[PDB]
Design an enzyme around this catalytic site. Sequence first.
Site, short mmCIF file in Angstrom:
data_model
loop_
_atom_site.label_atom_id
_atom_site.label_comp_id
_atom_site.label_asym_id
_atom_site.label_seq_id
_atom_site.Cartn_x
_atom_site.Cartn_y
_atom_site.Cartn_z
N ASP A 193 51.73 41.22 82.86
CA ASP A 193 50.35 41.49 82.48
C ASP A 193 49.49 40.32 82.97
OD1 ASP A 193 50.50 39.33 80.60
OD2 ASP A 193 49.75 40.57 78.96
N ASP A 195 46.39 37.70 81.44
CA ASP A 195 45.78 37.18 80.21
C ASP A 195 44.51 36.42 80.54
OD1 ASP A 195 47.96 37.87 78.33
OD2 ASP A 195 49.07 36.61 79.71
N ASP A 249 45.31 41.47 78.73
CA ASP A 249 44.93 40.96 77.42
C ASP A 249 43.63 40.18 77.53
OD1 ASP A 249 47.16 42.06 76.21
OD2 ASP A 249 48.38 40.24 76.44
MN LIG Z 1 49.30 39.13 77.81
NA NA Z 2 51.13 37.30 80.19
#
Ligand SMILES: [Mn+2]
Ligand code: NA
Length: 325
Positions: A193, A195, A249
Amino acid sequence: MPAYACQRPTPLTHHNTGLSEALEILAEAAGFEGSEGRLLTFCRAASVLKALPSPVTTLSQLQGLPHFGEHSSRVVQELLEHGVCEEVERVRRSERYQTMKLFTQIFGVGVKTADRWYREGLRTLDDLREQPQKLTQQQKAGLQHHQDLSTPVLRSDVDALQQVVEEAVGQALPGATVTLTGGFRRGKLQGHDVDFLITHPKEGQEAGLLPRVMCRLQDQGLILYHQFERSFCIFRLPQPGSWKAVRVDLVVAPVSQFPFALLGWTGSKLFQRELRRFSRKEKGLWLNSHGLFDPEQKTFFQAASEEDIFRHLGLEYLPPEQRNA
DNA sequence: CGGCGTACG
DNA sequence: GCCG
Ligand SMILES: [Mn+2]
Ligand code: NA
Ligand SMILES: [Cl-]
Ligand SMILES: [Cl-]
Ligand code: NA
């Protein structure tokens, strides 16, 4: 070799990759069984090897290393002697490990949910798709997007995502900033992912920001899934002639807390656990991603930088690239 | 033996 | 599973 991971530099790449990966299999398997103490010891033992300056070639080199006892030392001994550890291989091929790994990798599925499904006899993603009455909306999204979410996010993907996030953030609140955190800030070239940490230089202006950011991303058609100050999104990332789903995120913090949030969201996960354990157990201070509390004086430490926080804990500063515990 | 990070959605 |  100090006992806590936050006391030593841990680079991203190192000299004991195979040994650490083996111990991390046992840590993961321990977590799938709810054995959080054994998970921690195996994680810490793996991390110690990451911090060593050269390869372990003989069992005697483990003498005096923290978190190496009978069990972790035997794992290493077998790998050194035979190139394989029977316990590790047993875990790897086991139906329990493979299915718990498959299920907990789904966004919206934790150990407790995976375990119940395992006990109900479920084994495959299509087993889950065939009974969608038993899934949350979050799990439905995680299953639909599971293939894309299994594909590594590349550093090239990150720069594209940061630009679109900055555009939405700039309309939601002029002057607000976007900082890349997580594993990419530690130098990783791939991830699961991306962030981002968002703030504004005028304390208080960040209040109410994330809904405004999310609304704007959604209106640009970039949000495949979302559910405040933390957002766990699935983004539509352009690809040549198409696109792919990517987990992103987003986190908002007031600028007064930004060093704590940056430290907390830059990781690694084990580094943060060890740092908070160190703070409380060795220094009597309570650390989180908002601040650092002295429970005797009942006061919060003001920090202007991550460097400040390391100093207030009596630790040598580690840049993000050396927090890969 | 007790302890094992600490939050938010 | 290991530390203190
Ligand atoms: Mn994350
Ligand atoms: Na991450
Ligand atoms: Cl345990
Ligand atoms: Cl926190
Ligand atoms: Na999951």
